[PDB]
Amino acid sequence: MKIEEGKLVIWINGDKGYNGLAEVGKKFEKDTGIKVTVEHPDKLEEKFPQVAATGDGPDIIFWAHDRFGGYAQSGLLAEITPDKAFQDKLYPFTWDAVRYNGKLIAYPIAVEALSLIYNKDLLPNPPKTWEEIPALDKELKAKGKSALMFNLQEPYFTWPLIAADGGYAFKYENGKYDIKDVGVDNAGAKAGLTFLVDLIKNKHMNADTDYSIAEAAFNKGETAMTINGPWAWSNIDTSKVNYGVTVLPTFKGQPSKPFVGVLSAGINAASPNKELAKEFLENYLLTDEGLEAVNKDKPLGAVALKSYEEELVKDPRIAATMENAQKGEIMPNIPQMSAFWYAVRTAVINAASGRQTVDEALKDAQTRIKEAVQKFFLEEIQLGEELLAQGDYEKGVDHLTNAIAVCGQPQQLLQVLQQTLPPPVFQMLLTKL
Numbered sequence: 001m002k003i004e005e006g007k008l009v010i011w012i013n014g015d016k017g018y019n020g021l022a023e024v025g026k027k028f029e030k031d032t033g034i035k036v037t038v039e040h041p042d043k044l045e046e047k048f049p050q051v052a053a054t055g056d057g058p059d060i061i062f063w064a065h066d067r068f069g070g071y072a073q074s075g076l077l078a079e080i081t082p083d084k085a086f087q088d089k090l091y092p093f094t095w096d097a098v099r100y101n102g103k104l105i106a107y108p109i110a111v112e113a114l115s116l117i118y119n120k121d122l123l124p125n126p127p128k129t130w131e132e133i134p135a136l137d138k139e140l141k142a143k144g145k146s147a148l149m150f151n152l153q154e155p156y157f158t159w160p161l162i163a164a165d166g167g168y169a170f171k172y173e174n175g176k177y178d179i180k181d182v183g184v185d186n187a188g189a190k191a192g193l194t195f196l197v198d199l200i201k202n203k204h205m206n207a208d209t210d211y212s213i214a215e216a217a218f219n220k221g222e223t224a225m226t227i228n229g230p231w232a233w234s235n236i237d238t239s240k241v242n243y244g245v246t247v248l249p250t251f252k253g254q255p256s257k258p259f260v261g262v263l264s265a266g267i268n269a270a271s272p273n274k275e276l277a278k279e280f281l282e283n284y285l286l287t288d289e290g291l292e293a294v295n296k297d298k299p300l301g302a303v304a305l306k307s308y309e310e311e312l313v314k315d316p317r318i319a320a321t322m323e324n325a326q327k328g329e330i331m332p333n334i335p336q337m338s339a340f341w342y343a344v345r346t347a348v349i350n351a352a353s354g355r356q357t358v359d360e361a362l363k364d365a366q367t368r369i370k371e372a373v374q375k376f377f378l379e380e381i382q383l384g385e386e387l388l389a390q391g392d393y394e395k396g397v398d399h400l401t402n403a404i405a406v407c408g409q410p411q412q413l414l415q416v417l418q419q420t421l422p423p424p425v426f427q428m429l430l431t432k433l
């Protein structure tokens with residue numbers, strides 16, 4: 001319990017280059033004395049918030065930035081304090097992905113986006129744009145031995161299709177997300193998922209296809225294309241398949257819109273080694289030499305460090321990654337992203353398996369998301385009132401702002417609060433808007 005005392009523990013997903021990370025740690029331990037222990041547990045993005053509520057867990061946790069707003073919101077993450085000189089060394093937009101309540105809550109590392117990966121021997125010239133070729137993606141598989149295999153179990157991999165003709169998580173009106181304008185239930189979304197289920201009903205894909213199956217199929221030459229991120233490339237090299245990495249096909253003339261993750265590194269708020277964790281991230285990991293050591297293990301994508309990214313952009317595969325990234329959307333980092341992912345994972349699994357229709361499946365996902373934002377609103381009103389009565393006004397009012405962010409009529413609620421708050425507390429609330 002309460003790990004540890006003068007060492008660093010890091011968690012990263014088992015699909016990343018954790019051996020390369022451990023190399024950077026050794027170098028850290030050599031220059032310094034401080035041992036670095038890198039682990040790759042399962043469901044780390046769900047294990048993390050549990051054990052960090054304990055006050056336990058790792059010092060540093062790696063995940064895509066979408067989860068981090070939820071951690072920050074629960075107070076599991078220390079604010080980070082790069083000094084301007086250092087902020088200049090990373091791209092502004094990666095710095096935006098790790099901003100929550102106007103505070104930086106992680107160090108951005110890399111930009112990950114899915115791409116179409118194809119076997120050049122089986123298939124020189126991959127199915128363009130889809131969109132006279134989904135008839136022919138459908139038919140390209142008709143020259144059987146399998147045209148396409150990728151992970152149906154995780155909705156990250158199916159979203160690019162669900163979103164192509166208008167599906168979406170939460171609407172932007174010009175910046176602020178309108179949580180409760182949810183788009184998993186709409187025409188665009190129903191059509192993309194329908195097309196997916198039709199691929200399965202016509203026997204071009206198996207609904208039980210997972211990560212390892214698809215990885216294995218492509219790596220043995222049994223299928224002509226997979227959908228995957230840069231981490232997968234090193235295995236494909238090892239497999240000695242002659243492969244390309246290209247743009248995802250379009251749907252109804254429109255590009256596939258992947259959700260783009262920025263692999264990020266948060267510092268546990270309960271960590272006793274926050275200054276050590278900072279020296280490592282800024283002065284070891286985030287260096288040309290640190291990122292190359294991770295990248296040689298499993299490629300990172302387009303790194304957030306400019307000096308190093310200036311070399312990687314000469315790789316066509318990285319050009320392919322960035323096109324797809326540009327055509328898609330950078331993920332929200334808001335706490336509701338969790339409910340979104342879980343709702344949609346259930347919709348995709350159920351429709352593919354046949355347990356519900358496309359429509360029923362997306363409407364139950366739409367409903368679950370709305371219910372999660374509503375639950376969260378009640379919680380935050382309650383929390384808000386309590387941490388006022390205990391005189392922790394700054395936190396007390398922070399929860400009231402959270403509630404207002406997800407409200408039906410936020411103006412009606414602002415009135416009630418000026419009526420129930422003492423004026424200084426009300427003013428202090430307006431600063432947290």
Ligand SMILES: OC[C@H]1O[C@H](O[C@H]2[C@H](O)[C@@H](O)[C@@H](O)O[C@@H]2CO)[C@H](O)[C@@H](O)[C@@H]1O
Pocket residue numbers: 013015045064066067112154155156157261341
């Ligand atoms: O499938 C939902 C899942 O999508 C994303 O997870 C990605 C992760 O971002 C990638 O770095 C890589 O690990 O593949 C994962 C997909 O299995 C979101 O990051 C995640 O929060 C979400 O649950």
